[PDB]
Design an enzyme around this catalytic site. Structure first.
Site, short mmCIF file in Angstrom:
data_model
loop_
_atom_site.label_atom_id
_atom_site.label_comp_id
_atom_site.label_asym_id
_atom_site.label_seq_id
_atom_site.Cartn_x
_atom_site.Cartn_y
_atom_site.Cartn_z
N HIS A 17 -70.34 -32.38 3.82
CA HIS A 17 -71.48 -31.91 4.59
C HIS A 17 -71.61 -30.40 4.61
CE1 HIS A 17 -72.07 -35.93 6.83
NE2 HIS A 17 -71.22 -36.13 5.84
N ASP A 113 -75.94 -31.57 12.13
CA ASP A 113 -75.48 -32.62 11.24
C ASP A 113 -75.85 -33.99 11.83
OD1 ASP A 113 -74.36 -33.54 8.92
OD2 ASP A 113 -72.34 -32.79 9.34
O1 UPG Z 1 -61.60 -33.48 -7.56
C1 UPG Z 1 -62.62 -33.03 -7.15
C2 UPG Z 1 -63.33 -33.72 -6.09
C3 UPG Z 1 -64.57 -33.17 -5.58
N1 UPG Z 1 -65.14 -31.94 -6.13
C4 UPG Z 1 -66.39 -31.42 -5.61
O2 UPG Z 1 -66.40 -31.56 -4.05
C5 UPG Z 1 -67.80 -32.23 -3.71
C6 UPG Z 1 -67.53 -33.69 -3.33
O3 UPG Z 1 -68.75 -34.31 -3.02
P1 UPG Z 1 -68.68 -35.85 -2.44
O4 UPG Z 1 -68.26 -36.82 -3.51
O5 UPG Z 1 -70.04 -36.24 -1.88
O6 UPG Z 1 -67.54 -35.83 -1.25
P2 UPG Z 1 -67.45 -36.87 0.02
O7 UPG Z 1 -66.39 -36.34 0.95
O8 UPG Z 1 -67.09 -38.25 -0.48
O9 UPG Z 1 -68.92 -36.95 0.78
C7 UPG Z 1 -68.98 -37.43 2.05
O10 UPG Z 1 -70.25 -36.87 2.61
C8 UPG Z 1 -71.39 -37.32 1.79
C9 UPG Z 1 -72.65 -36.85 2.46
O11 UPG Z 1 -72.81 -37.58 3.65
C10 UPG Z 1 -71.43 -38.85 1.62
O12 UPG Z 1 -72.41 -39.20 0.64
C11 UPG Z 1 -70.11 -39.43 1.19
O13 UPG Z 1 -70.16 -40.88 1.16
C12 UPG Z 1 -69.04 -38.95 2.10
O14 UPG Z 1 -67.77 -39.52 1.74
C13 UPG Z 1 -68.51 -32.14 -4.79
O15 UPG Z 1 -69.25 -30.91 -4.83
C14 UPG Z 1 -67.40 -32.14 -6.04
O16 UPG Z 1 -68.06 -31.58 -7.18
C15 UPG Z 1 -64.45 -31.17 -7.24
O17 UPG Z 1 -64.91 -30.17 -7.67
N2 UPG Z 1 -63.15 -31.79 -7.72
#
Ligand code: UPG
Length: 467
Positions: A17, A113
């Site tokens: 977020h 949020d």
């Molecule tokens: O190994 C990694 C893992 C993540 N990232 C980056 O970190 C962000 C991760 O995004 P995301 O996959 O959406 O993380 P989540 O924590 O899973 O997102 C949470 O928040 C989002 C918005 O509500 C929801 O869609 C998800 O289900 C919820 O788990 C992105 O920019 C990635 O590119 C990296 O660079 N390397």
């Protein structure tokens, strides 16, 4: 030069977020200044401090004095903890707003949020425009807005429904695939989610990180005015940029490997930092990758239920995930696949021409990054609203394939191999790729100088500067 109005952002969750919230704010610089007013239940984390301190000067941060949550049950889901955190931090939020207003600054809006809607009361009492930033899908937004009606017209647990839930303007979804917090209607998580969904109409607008080219149904339904329904501003896809537009041109080691591989030939596998698999589940995936002819790049984490403790560790001191892979996997895989521990430069991997597929947990930021760079998906949802995202991505847009889960919660190698093979070299995989390239072009278009999303951002800025 006019004095920049001040905007305050109240986040409720972690990086998923903050990232889109920061990107949103960066698009609106320098017209405004921003303060992240972060509620806390303990000392802020190092990643939180590092990420928020890396932002432009016009965005500063205030970590509110931590509230005590020890009275909550240790079984409490994160939704309950987030709601309690915001509610109990509201007096400090008033103090922070006071420090700004008492100095003569004009506070134009309060951006909350999706689990911080109680802070809207503060905004209303102070004459500040309250807006909700929705970092997920328009489909999940529609579900939130309809949750009240659904709660009144359904008594049983949603998994027990035999028919798929129909949400205004969205593809049907089976109750078993609805978001995690509604799977136990007796838990405080569900009651808080219901409480927040009923407060969206208190905002002057909901800002959603999506666009019509991606969610035509939900967005057109949401833009249709109805009394008691807030204005909706689609501004997505809001995602970070790659390291090409960062600074020093030093190349990570995984991208060297990707250059050596041919076009569109590598399946990137990343479940995210909250997607730890069981030992059995990780063994099923490894076995399929070992016996495959597919080139892959796999970010792996230590399983959640190892029979024994860790014996090998990395220089930093954390458990070494690579010494937990099956016997000889690393030798069996050498050359065709590259395994990475814990983390990888995801955006840059997805932007690489060699990357041809993305096995993902369907986090919306990851989905948006894959869509913007045109990498088709294998939808492996795990928690939160990822299952909803998966249904919409596979059965609606048809830009991915979802492996079926077994009755024991395990996705067997047969299903993993099926979706990998179909996506990367089947006929449905070519149709899925063509569609994803179309969405890639639509995503760049809406962000154009005169596109749907940039104009929506301009509308939000205008509203904030108005009156
Ligand atoms: O190994 C990694 C893992 C993540 N990232 C980056 O970190 C962000 C991760 O995004 P995301 O996959 O959406 O993380 P989540 O924590 O899973 O997102 C949470 O928040 C989002 C918005 O509500 C929801 O869609 C998800 O289900 C919820 O788990 C992105 O920019 C990635 O590119 C990296 O660079 N390397």
């Amino acid at each position: 030069t006019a004095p920049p109005p001040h905007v305050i952002i109240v986040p409720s969750a972690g990086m998923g977020h903050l990232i889109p919230l920061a990107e949103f704010a960066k698009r609106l610089l320098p017209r405004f200044t921003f303060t992240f007013a972060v509620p806390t239940s303990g000392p802020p984390s190092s990643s939180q401090r590092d990420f928020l301190s890396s932002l432009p000067a016009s965005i500063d941060t205030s970590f509110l004095p931590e509230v005590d949550l020890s009275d909550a049950p240790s079984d409490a889901q994160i939704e309950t903890l987030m709601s309690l955190m915001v509610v109990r931090s509201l007096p400090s939020l008033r103090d922070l707003i006071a420090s700004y207003s008492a100095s003569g600054r004009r506070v134009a809006a309060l951006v909350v949020d999706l689990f911080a809607t109680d802070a809207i009361d503060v905004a209303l009492e102070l004459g500040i425009r309250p807006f909700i930033f929705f970092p997920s899908t328009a489909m999940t937004l529609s579900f939130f807005l309809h949750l009240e009606k659904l709660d009144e017209t359904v008594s049983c647990e949603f998994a027990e429904l035999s028919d798929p839930v129909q949400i205004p303007g969205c593809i049907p979804v089976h109750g078993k695939d609805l978001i995690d917090p509604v799977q136990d209607r007796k838990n405080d998580a569900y009651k808080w989610l219901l409480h927040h969904s009923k407060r969206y109409k208190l905002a002057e607008g909901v800002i959603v990180n999506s666009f019509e080219g991606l969610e035509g149904g939900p967005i057109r339904e949401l833009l249709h005015p109805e009394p008691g329904k807030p204005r909706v501003y689609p501004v997505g896809p809001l995602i970070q940029a790659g390291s090409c537009e960062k600074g020093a041109a030093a190349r990570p080691e995984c991208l060297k490997w990707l250059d050596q591989q041919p076009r569109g030939s590598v399946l990137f596998v990343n479940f995210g930092s909250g997607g730890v698999l069981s030992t059995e589940q990780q063994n099923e995936l490894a076995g399929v990758l070992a016996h495959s002819q597919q080139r892959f790049l796999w970010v792996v984490r230590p399983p959640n239920d190892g029979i024994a403790n860790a014996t090998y560790f990395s220089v930093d001191g954390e458990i070494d995930p690579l010494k937990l892979l099956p016997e000889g996997f690393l030798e069996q895989t050498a050359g065709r696949g590259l395994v990475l521990p814990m983390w990888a430069p995801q955006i840059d991997v997805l932007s690489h021409e060699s990357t041809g597929g993305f096995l993902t947990h369907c986090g919306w930021n990851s989905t948006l990054e894959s869509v913007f760079h045109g990498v088709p998906l294998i939808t492996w949802p795990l928690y939160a609203e990822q299952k909803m995202n998966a249904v919409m991505l596979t059965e609606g847009l048809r830009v991915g394939l979802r492996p079926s889960v077994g009755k024991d919660g395990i996705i067997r190698g047969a299903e993993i191999a099926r979706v990998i093979g179909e996506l990367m070299e089947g006929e449905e995989g070519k149709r899925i790729r063509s569609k994803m390239q179309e969405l890639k072009r639509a995503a760049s278009a809406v962000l154009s100088k005169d596109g749907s999303s940039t104009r929506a951002l301009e509308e939000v800025a205008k509203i904030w500067e108005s009156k």
